[PDB]
Amino acid sequence: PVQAGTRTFIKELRSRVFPSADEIIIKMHGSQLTQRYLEKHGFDVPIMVPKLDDLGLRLPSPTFSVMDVERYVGGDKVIDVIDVARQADSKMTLHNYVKYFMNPNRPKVLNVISLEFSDTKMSELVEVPDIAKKLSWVENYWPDDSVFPKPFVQKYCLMGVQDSYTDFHIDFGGTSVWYHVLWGEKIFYLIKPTDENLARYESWSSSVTQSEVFFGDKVDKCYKCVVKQGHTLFVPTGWIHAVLTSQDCMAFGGNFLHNLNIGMQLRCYEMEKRLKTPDLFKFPFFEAICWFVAKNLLETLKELREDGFQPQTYLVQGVKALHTALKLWMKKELVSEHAFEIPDNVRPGHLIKELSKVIRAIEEEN
Numbered sequence: 001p002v003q004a005g006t007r008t009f010i011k012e013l014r015s016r017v018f019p020s021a022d023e024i025i026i027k028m029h030g031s032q033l034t035q036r037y038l039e040k041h042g043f044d045v046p047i048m049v050p051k052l053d054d055l056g057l058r059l060p061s062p063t064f065s066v067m068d069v070e071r072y073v074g075g076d077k078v079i080d081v082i083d084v085a086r087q088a089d090s091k092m093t094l095h096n097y098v099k100y101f102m103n104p105n106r107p108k109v110l111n112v113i114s115l116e117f118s119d120t121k122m123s124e125l126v127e128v129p130d131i132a133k134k135l136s137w138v139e140n141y142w143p144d145d146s147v148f149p150k151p152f153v154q155k156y157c158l159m160g161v162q163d164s165y166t167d168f169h170i171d172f173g174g175t176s177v178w179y180h181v182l183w184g185e186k187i188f189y190l191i192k193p194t195d196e197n198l199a200r201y202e203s204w205s206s207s208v209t210q211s212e213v214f215f216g217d218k219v220d221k222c223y224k225c226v227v228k229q230g231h232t233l234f235v236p237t238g239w240i241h242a243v244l245t246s247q248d249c250m251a252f253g254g255n256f257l258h259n260l261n262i263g264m265q266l267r268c269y270e271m272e273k274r275l276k277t278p279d280l281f282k283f284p285f286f287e288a289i290c291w292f293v294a295k296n297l298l299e300t301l302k303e304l305r306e307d308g309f310q311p312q313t314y315l316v317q318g319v320k321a322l323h324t325a326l327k328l329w330m331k332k333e334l335v336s337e338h339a340f341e342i343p344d345n346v347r348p349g350h351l352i353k354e355l356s357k358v359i360r361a362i363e364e365e366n
């Protein structure tokens with residue numbers, strides 16, 4: 001059996017000529033990627049922006065090194081590191097990872113993919129893509145007076161050695177991600193979240209043979225997307241993907257929830273709860289933000305209704321899925337595990353009623 005992450009596994013991966021991600025992604029200039037464009041054409045496939053012009057994305061020059069990351073972050077910080085050949089999570093001091101990274105002879109393939117630095121001096125060196133900030137639920141609906149700590153999942157520093165490999169997964173909470181390669185190269189294996197593919201992914205995730213079964217073989221198409229230096233890739237809600245560091249690489253990326261695919265975001269959240277995924281620990285208050293969002297979406301629909309307008313389809317679909325999720329979390333036999341995420345400022349039972357009728361109305365008056 002070929003174990004994910006091992007040298008043998010990588011020889012196969014590097015030799016297969018998968019369908020090109022050019023068959024499904026949309027390439028565009030940074031100025032075309034607007035909230036407006038996304039609301040009209042949707043955000044259903046990955047978007048590639050080869051040049052960073054007009055993205056609003058700011059970051060160190062191409063010579064920024066891992067040594068520099070250690071300076072701005074602090075070698076003492078303990079970080080998650082993946083022992084790729086064993087597909088296991090380990091720990092290290094940022095200091096030793098950098099020592100391991102610069103050592104010409106690496107006894108093992110180690111990868112760093114969860115280093116969030118918005119709480120460090122390196123944060124001032126990075127401004128995330130404007131589009132992420134425009135769409136971000138956290139940027140738009142997180143109150144300045146919540147008891148819940150604000151989630152910081154917007155700035156990650158990724159460093160991996162050649163052949164680092166991250167197996168197929170869906171970003172935590174169904175978030176979308178922006179990913180930029182500073183230097184080196186990353187190759188993404190993308191899989192569309194069709195109802196068939198999600199189902200199989202959840203089955204594959206809960207099978208003991210997960211590490212010996214290439215998930216790419218269980219679906220009709222697994223798209224290969226090469227992300228080269230200077231390029232920026234945006235992956236939308238629910239997309240299943242694996243990543244191969246084809247060569248020593250440093251990249252930056254971030255996660256964000258938004259209003260375009262709420263249903264899918266909710267679906268991914270529930271799946272994660274069924275699989276008991278450790279990633280959910282990164283967006284601990286997913287439910288709290290959903291409550292905050294339901295208040296804002298309620299307001300918009302109320303404003304539109306009271307003035308004779310019909311909301312856009314995706315907004316009605318999204319609110320409907322939100323309504324269903326909120327009602328579920330409030331069920332008598334389940335509310336005890338959900339109550340702590342209900343914001344002080346919201347009235348659960350009432351917010352659900354208002355939502356239920358605004359929806360019903362739109363359903364009848366249509």
Ligand SMILES: [Fe+2]
Nearest residue numbers: 169170171241
């Ligand atoms: Fe990912």
Ligand SMILES: [Fe+2]
Nearest residue numbers: 137138256257
């Ligand atoms: Fe967000």
